[PDB]
Amino acid sequence: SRTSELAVGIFVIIFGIALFFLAMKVSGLVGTNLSDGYTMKAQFDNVNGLKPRAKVTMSGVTIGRVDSITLDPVTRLATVTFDLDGKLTSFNAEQLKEVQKNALDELRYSSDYTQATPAQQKTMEQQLISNMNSITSIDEDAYIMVATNGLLGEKYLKIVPGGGLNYLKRGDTISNTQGTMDLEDLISKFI
Amino acid sequence: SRTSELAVGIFVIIFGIALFFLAMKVSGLVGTNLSDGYTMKAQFDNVNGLKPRAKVTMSGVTIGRVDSITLDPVTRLATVTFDLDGKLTSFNAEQLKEVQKNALDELRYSSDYTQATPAQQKTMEQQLISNMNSITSIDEDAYIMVATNGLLGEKYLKIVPGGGLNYLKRGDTISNTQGTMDLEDLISKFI
Amino acid sequence: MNTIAWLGRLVIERIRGIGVAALMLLQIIFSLPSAGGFGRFVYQMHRVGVMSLLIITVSGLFIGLVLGLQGYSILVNVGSESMLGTMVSLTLLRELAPVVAALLFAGRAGSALTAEIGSMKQSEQLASMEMIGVDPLKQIVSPRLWAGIVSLPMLTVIFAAIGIVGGKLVGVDFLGVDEGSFWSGMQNNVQFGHDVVNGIIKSIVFALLCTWIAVFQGYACDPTPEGIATAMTRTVVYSSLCVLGFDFVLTAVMFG
Amino acid sequence: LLIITVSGLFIGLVLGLQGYSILVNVGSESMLGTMVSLTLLRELAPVVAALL
Numbered sequence: 160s161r162t163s164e165l166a167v168g169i170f171v172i173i174f175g176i177a178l179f180f181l182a183m184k185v186s187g188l189v190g191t192n193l194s195d196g197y198t199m200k201a202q203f204d205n206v207n208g209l210k211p212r213a214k215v216t217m218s219g220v221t222i223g224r225v226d227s228i229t230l231d232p233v234t235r236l237a238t239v240t241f242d243l244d245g246k247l248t249s250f251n252a253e254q255l256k257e258v259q260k261n262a263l264d265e266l267r268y269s270s271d272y273t274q275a276t277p278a279q280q281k282t283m284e285q286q287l288i289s290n291m292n293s294i295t296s297i298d299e300d301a302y303i304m305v306a307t308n309g310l311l312g313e314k315y316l317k318i319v320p321g322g323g324l325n326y327l328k329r330g331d332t333i334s335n336t337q338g339t340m341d342l343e344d345l346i347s348k349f350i
Numbered sequence: 351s352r353t354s355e356l357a358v359g360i361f362v363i364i365f366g367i368a369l370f371f372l373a374m375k376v377s378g379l380v381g382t383n384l385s386d387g388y389t390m391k392a393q394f395d396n397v398n399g400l401k402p403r404a405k406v407t408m409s410g411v412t413i414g415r416v417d418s419i420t421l422d423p424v425t426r427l428a429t430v431t432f433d434l435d436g437k438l439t440s441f442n443a444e445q446l447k448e449v450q451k452n453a454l455d456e457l458r459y460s461s462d463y464t465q466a467t468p469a470q471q472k473t474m475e476q477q478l479i480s481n482m483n484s485i486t487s488i489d490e491d492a493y494i495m496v497a498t499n500g501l502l503g504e505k506y507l508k509i510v511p512g513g514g515l516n517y518l519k520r521g522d523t524i525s526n527t528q529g530t531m532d533l534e535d536l537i538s539k540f541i
Numbered sequence: 542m543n544t545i546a547w548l549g550r551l552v553i554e555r556i557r558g559i560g561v562a563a564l565m566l567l568q569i570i571f572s573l574p575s576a577g578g579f580g581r582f583v584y585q586m587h588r589v590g591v592m593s594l595l596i597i598t599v600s601g602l603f604i605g606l607v608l609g610l611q612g613y614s615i616l617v618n619v620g621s622e623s624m625l626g627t628m629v630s631l632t633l634l635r636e637l638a639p640v641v642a643a644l645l646f647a648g649r650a651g652s653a654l655t656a657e658i659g660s661m662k663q664s665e666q667l668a669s670m671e672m673i674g675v676d677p678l679k680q681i682v683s684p685r686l687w688a689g690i691v692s693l694p695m696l697t698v699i700f701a702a703i704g705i706v707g708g709k710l711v712g713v714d715f716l717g718v719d720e721g722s723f724w725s726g727m728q729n730n731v732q733f734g735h736d737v738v739n740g741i742i743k744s745i746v747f748a749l750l751c752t753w754i755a756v757f758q759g760y761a762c763d764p765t766p767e768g769i770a771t772a773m774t775r776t777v778v779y780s781s782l783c784v785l786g787f788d789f790v791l792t793a794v795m796f797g
Numbered sequence: 798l799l800i801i802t803v804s805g806l807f808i809g810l811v812l813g814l815q816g817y818s819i820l821v822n823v824g825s826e827s828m829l830g831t832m833v834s835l836t837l838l839r840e841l842a843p844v845v846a847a848l849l
Contacts, residue, residue: 161557168560182790186797218428219397219530220421247421257424296423306534308398311502312824317534320426345537354587361591365695368702375724376630376705377733502621502823611840615832628819636815644848778800781849785807792811796818 193244197329200240205338214315298323304337386436394428396529406507453477489514493526562757581684590692593650601700605707626723627730629708638701639743647780651755652773658759659769689752697744750783
């Protein structure tokens, strides 16, 4: 029986570790509790006060977290590396129906009509090989930047959705960036 | 004997006081009650920390909450649903003539009726059927915005009124907006 | 290598000791109650609950006088003490009143149950009760366990209500802050279902551990007049470690 | 020595987790290291370590 007691005791503590590593994940405090995440990165010139686990916002809505900040010695440009949730920035199988009649509607416009070929089957062929696979909501004339969240809150990456032509692939690097504006420069201009 | 039946009955009384004191003298339960509310909605270009169950003001008075702030990823703009009230914000049983006697006053004015399509009873009968139900105090030229009180407090929504000849009916999208400003906005606009 | 051998023998007996106390809990709560079981639960609510009412109400006042006096000395430098009524009622409702009122319940009414069931074991009242046929778990132990799970969440509310009222006394009426901005700072920042209900669920998990330990130590004693008193310090130590241990786990879930 | 060192850790994990949840709304958490070491040094460590 004593063995029984023992067992029914090793099963409590093992269950007591199964709870501590459940409540540490759902707290956000360890691991990544955001679904199907895909990773993009950018190149700044100056990113002050930006640790990992920062906010990435599209219009003020938290979509992602930052993971690593490295610095290239030769070119002197910093490097951010963030992960974005994909449940609400991607066009999934339903949401293709909203973009296929919109992203290919800019392709068959009056600008592209008498420009390449008025016999071309490429203008519809470019979209569905890019609409179905590796799509984002982010346009190819958007720039990203660092903002402040209350002139007192910690820094957070901010996307500025500007215009729209085309998307990125899952894993692409945003070209256009905008650096911060630190404290000791604002007091130069203000005076 | 009867003491142990009584000195527990006192213990439930002193618990009964100190539970009622917490709910309706400390916690906000008695102050939050949507008096026969409904729901309208809007679309924003920046919601930088508009936390749910915030407050909505018309002139500096609480007439609404916040329920959901999600993206609209076909335009990448926000989407907020706020539940106002049906006694502070609409015209009640006696008050229904006060908006038909104002529709006849400034809207059905003869110098105003002789500025549009020619009729005698087209708009004159519409103001008796459209204006009777599904109508709030908000004139439709009143654009909602995000604001904050002080320089440390949370974000709250402000409806600035003015003008207006038709009223927003029910579940309608408030026309214009403006986003919230912080350090990434202001010093890039102070120049 | 005897000290390492004695140390490994110590924590193996303490592991087995958990497994006996787990099987003792499944025998109490998985049983429909015997006839007369409510008449003893009302009496055991008198011993555990009502006798503990004096220490909690007095000590709850003394923390409120400290929280109002320390929160004013910090919030006067930043000059914003319309948040005094918030941080007093936010320190108590989610953090101190679940925790401190379980550190005083383990002492006063926690260890008293281990003396009560413990002295019944050395003087053979438990062994005599069984030969009549009455099962001592259902008769003696089970009205004491259910009077512990009920009487502590009724006592953290009296701890939290007296602590805020005491903090209102030294903040508003002695140091001189505004009374209206004291109360109106509370209803903005302190919700009910996120703060007052989550301060009650935190004390039900605490009331289970300070009672299931304090009953098991007095049931599995060794019958000896100086073996009882060594199991009354085993139940104050083990309760204060499981209160502070399940504090961090419940705080990370509720406020993470 | 064993009860105090273990239970002293569990309060520190709570004070760091509660002080961050409040000081992130006002956005000033360079005072996190102050309020943790000010709650312990003058108030909690004299009191809780006498209750244990």
